[PDB]
Design a protein around this nucleic acid. Sequence first.
RNA 1: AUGAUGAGGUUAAUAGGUUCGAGGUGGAAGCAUGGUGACAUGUGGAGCUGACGAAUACUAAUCGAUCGAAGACUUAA
RNA 2: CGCGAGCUGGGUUCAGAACGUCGUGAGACAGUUCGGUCCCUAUCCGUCGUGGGCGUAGGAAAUUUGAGAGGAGCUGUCCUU
RNA 3: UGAGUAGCGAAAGACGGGUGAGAAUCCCGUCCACCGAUUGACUAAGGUUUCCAGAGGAAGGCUCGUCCGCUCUGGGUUAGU
RNA 4: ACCGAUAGUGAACCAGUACCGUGAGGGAAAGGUGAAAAGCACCCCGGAAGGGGAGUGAAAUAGAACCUGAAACCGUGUGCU
RNA 5: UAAGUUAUUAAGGGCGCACGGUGGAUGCCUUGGCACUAGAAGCCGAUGAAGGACGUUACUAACGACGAUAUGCUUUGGG
Lengths: 50, 44, 121, 111
Amino acid sequence: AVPKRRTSKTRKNKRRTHFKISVPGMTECPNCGEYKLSHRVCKNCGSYNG
Amino acid sequence: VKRTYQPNKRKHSKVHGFRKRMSTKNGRKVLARRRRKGRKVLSA
Amino acid sequence: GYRKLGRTSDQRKAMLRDLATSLIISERIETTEARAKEVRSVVEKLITLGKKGDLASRRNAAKTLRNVEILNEDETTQTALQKLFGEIAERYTERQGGYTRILKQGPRRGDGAESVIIELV
Amino acid sequence: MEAKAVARTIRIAPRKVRLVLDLIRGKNAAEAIAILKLTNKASSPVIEKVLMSALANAEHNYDMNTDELVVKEAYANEGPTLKRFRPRAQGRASAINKRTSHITIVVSDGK
RNA sequence: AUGAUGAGGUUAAUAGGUUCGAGGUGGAAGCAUGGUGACAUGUGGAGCUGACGAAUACUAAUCGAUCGAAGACUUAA
RNA sequence: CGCGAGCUGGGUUCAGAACGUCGUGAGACAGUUCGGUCCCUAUCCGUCGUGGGCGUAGGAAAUUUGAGAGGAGCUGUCCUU
RNA sequence: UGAGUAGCGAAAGACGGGUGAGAAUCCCGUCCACCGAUUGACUAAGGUUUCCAGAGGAAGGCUCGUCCGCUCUGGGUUAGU
RNA sequence: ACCGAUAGUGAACCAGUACCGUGAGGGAAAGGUGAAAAGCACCCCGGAAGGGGAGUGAAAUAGAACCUGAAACCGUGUGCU
RNA sequence: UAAGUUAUUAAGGGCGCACGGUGGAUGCCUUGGCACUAGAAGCCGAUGAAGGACGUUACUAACGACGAUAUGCUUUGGG
């Protein structure tokens, strides 16, 4: 089927309300100091210690 | 499917070449009318 | 099976035999989280068979394991079965199961699919 | 003052980049490196570049402390698009828009 | 479908492995014996066994992080 | 004569061919017979399932009442009197 | 606008090691799978420089790309039968 | 008392050209930095592209996509809601 | 305690404004064309024409010029 009527740019931005993407869910490494991704291995420096 | 252009150098020059246009009164008209327009390629 | 791996039965079984052989050849590999969650349960049972030791336990190992030779024995050439029944078995002869461990790395580029480092414990 | 960096005519559609930019907008700049470094998306590396450049414009050629820096204003504008073609069936042809973007980040110290 | 719903996150039985069973198959390999041979018998309801029941911290649910209240206004009691 | 952006294409009314018949003829039926491309990714309303936000004058967990709304609602036969 | 929607063109890859700013995809290797009256070998037409080496990765490649039939720089076709 | 870049020749510009067609044949689009290239030394981020400074210039929101720079369209922030 | 009244939230959206990007309208301009006027002249070729192909430069894709004497040769004048 075809759209019978173009979408007003208010309805477009209403539909795009939930199209946001979420944070990565990250923590501070207790060895690296830099940030890691929880339950993952520190890309920056070394081990996982779990 | 077999399409309509099946290239062939011999046929192309035998049927549209220069010597085949220079053999007719109308081939000569063709070449003169392409020179009136100033084409780069006269024959093929 | 637990989880179809986006493959077909013969194709998936070949996949898992290859991964298991490579794991006990290299003792640690980087793979995808689901492939690892399956290679886990495959190589666990292979090393159980290795710990058993009997000949039928060897011929059963010899059907779910590939045929590679380990050139880098310092001029020695082990097959994967000889490796699995000497070294891996004699190593893990104390603990009662749980012979590997999976470590998440992060999202692979080009898929966003998580990468894991499955290795022998 | 307010330092800024720009990346003009990056080859990513700008409304794919606005997704990532809606995460770092207003964060302590010490976080924003790691946030962009940890997320799945593809527009994150080419924004890590622009952010690190706008932060290396704070220490150098101005004199600011790059701990005191929040990402005051990040955003992305449209660039020139590259209009291509894709042959559909039956002689039809559909246009393609390989769009671009200008990624602008402005870090400040709040003074 | 995803989210949500529930069961758990070590002070732990949530999933995998391990040891037992349940059910399914139907007598594993090797060896000895009889046949010259295809085979048969014993060792032996044996050996294998995905999803079902139980126990066992061996592996992984680490460490952390966020959100979330201080109780309006009259009137009568 | 509900329903083909749900299905079919058997009849009737596309090009082929034939019978009877009307027409000098090209051709036509009161007819009859064999064959013959049924496209669409759902924007809005509607419908069916499912989440998020805020509201419900503090912030929560659990158990509920029921204003309403929906579902079901059929029937024979044999024995006894 | 439709919309971050349909599509990404029949099919088996896996892992190790390299290179590198960046690797599911590039190079190497082992294993696995597919064709095998053919997905192999040689040729006519036709194309016309796409062939090779060393660099490159703005565009093309339905993703990626450090790679390429693409970009740059150099080269390569030898007949008395 | 002709046009002034959708105008004027199809063609202000390497135009009867890209391109399209077996062929005859059809056929576009494409002007403007500054007075003068003085066309951005050097530093910093980055693989580069691109930036931020310092410069040249009367002017760089005149940086070779280079006079003015509208509308559609796409964004960032806020005053009322 | 009870009965009543009333908001603040804005996931987002609306209008106003401020600031930016694409985009190439408008303004001004000309190495280009259009319509004529006055004056010439109105043919070229077997002593090879018009039109081309291939080449020619220190480094040459292409454009103009040139033809193995080739990015040009001699002479007559001007400058």
